[PDB]
């Protein structure tokens, strides 16, 4: 399992009044590239006429 989350970022605290505690609104995007190799067996030889 690959777990992903955005690291939460704190909003401002300090001299500004009434701020409370907040988080920055952030989202993440990206490209998931998945490569899978499969082993392949050969086809069985066919004796049939038809």
């Amino acid at each position: 399992q690959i777990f992903l989350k955005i690291l939460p970022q704190s909003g401002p605290i300090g001299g500004i009044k009434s701020m409370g505690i907040t988080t920055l609104v952030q989202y993440a995007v990206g490209i998931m590239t998945v490569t899978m190799t499969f082993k392949l067996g050969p086809r069985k030889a066919t004796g049939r006429w038809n």
Partner: protein, 51 residues
Amino acid sequence: LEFQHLIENYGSIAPDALTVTISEIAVKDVTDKTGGGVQVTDSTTGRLCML
């Protein structure tokens, strides 16, 4: 089946080489059978002409 396999698996076909073998030649003598009809025997002196 082999023609299906050809057309399923290949993009083109061309003739390349040919070999013809004539084998198991038997020149067979024929003669009358006892009680009628004919009977056949293998000939050591009969010859098949191949040109």
